[PDB]
Amino acid sequence: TQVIVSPNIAAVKQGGQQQFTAYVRATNAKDHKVVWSVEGGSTGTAITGD
Amino acid sequence: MRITFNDVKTSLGITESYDIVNAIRNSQGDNFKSYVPLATANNVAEVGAGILINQTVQNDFITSLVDRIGLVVIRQVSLNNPLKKFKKGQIPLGRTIEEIYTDITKEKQYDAEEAEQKVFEREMPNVKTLFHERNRQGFYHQTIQDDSLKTAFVSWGNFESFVSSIINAIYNSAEVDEYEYMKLLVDNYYSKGLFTTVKIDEPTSSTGALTEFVKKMRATARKLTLPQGSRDWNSMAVRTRSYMEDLHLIIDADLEAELDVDVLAKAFNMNRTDFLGNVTVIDGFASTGLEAVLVDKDWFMVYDNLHKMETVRNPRGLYWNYYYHVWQTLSVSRFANAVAFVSGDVPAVTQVIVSPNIAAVKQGGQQQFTAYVRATNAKDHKVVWSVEGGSTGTAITGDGLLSVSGNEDNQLTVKATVDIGTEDKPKLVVGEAVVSIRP
């Protein structure tokens, strides 16, 4: 039904880092894999699988 | 500190299903007809879910510069650990707890002829001990920006409300961590194989399986409280008994609803098909096959050594730091009964217990050892005895009698092994004991 990112508004400096966690609202007993991405628009910014 | 927001909408984690906003417009005699007479329904539908990002001063690192709110409310909740009732007292000084238990002796045969030469013979009282040590030391750290947050609220009461919320969050974190630490003891005990396992099919698969589980639980509870006692339900293999008022059952939340809807809502005189001991409801265990655990009140051996809070002030950063220190001992008593109901695929043998775990013999002495095999099935298993001291002349017989050569000086280890695996791939369950040698 939905995916909730625990930090919904974040503010970081240029050289800072942030951590995000995802909660998936599933109506079944299955486990669903999440994929992380960034829609900034410039290089030098990345996100890992965690 | 320079923060600018634009091109952002209130659709962070929103997955709209069928858009009643347009359903009301294109409502041709459906269930949405009642909302047609409403005039200003579009605004309510647009902003009735709560806005995370207000249009004036949307969000920023510190919310002190700009404030425009007609009413601010602070939500505050408190969390507690239901297992707090299982905690013992406090230990201000010292580190180790020693627990002592003396067992029963064996009966000898009357012999007047033999009694005339051993009236001064000796017989040890068969005592066992175990020790518990402090093993948890932690703290919770939280910083508050006193002066940066004084401006953020136009009212003083809001500022004390926020500070109280932070302190309550610290205490709730401590409570949740304590609950998890207490729950970890059962999982660790099951992992090490020190529980007494009873096999069940599945508590929630069907009503028949639920009734079978209830019957097994009641039979086990009856067996745990017999006056004569038994040594089949504690991990030290010591003859002991428990009490019904001291027996506690820990189950999941779904099972309670299953039971009270399937049997308790349809059975006359429902005391005949209900749980026997004290029931505690938790959110399940982390092990694959654990459904329920029945333990004695003395099974838990948890104490607390330190509980304190300290504060420091940083003037350059202009803030406060709070540290909450908690030190505890978390252990379990192997002398108490502890049965676990497992609905998976248990191994054939869980453990082997050697009754004398510590022994001290001289260079010409002898010792007798006993092995108890915790088998979950009705099959019979043969134990094999060995001694790995390394010095020749010392040997242990098949019945468990160890004899020491007159000339050897090293610490011996006595091993009782059971083979449960198949050929070409053996699986050994091993019990061990330590023997010291005197000159």
From Swiss-Prot, chain A:
Compartment list: Virion
Residues annotated as domain BIG2: 1-50
Subunit and interaction comment: Homohexamer. Homopentamer. The prolate capsid is composed of pentamers and hexamers of the capsid protein.
Protein role: Assembles to form a prolate capsid shell of about 54 nm in length and 45 nm in width, with a T=3, Q=5 symmetry.
Annotated family: Belongs to the phi29likevirus major capsid protein family.
Protein name according to UniProt: Major capsid protein
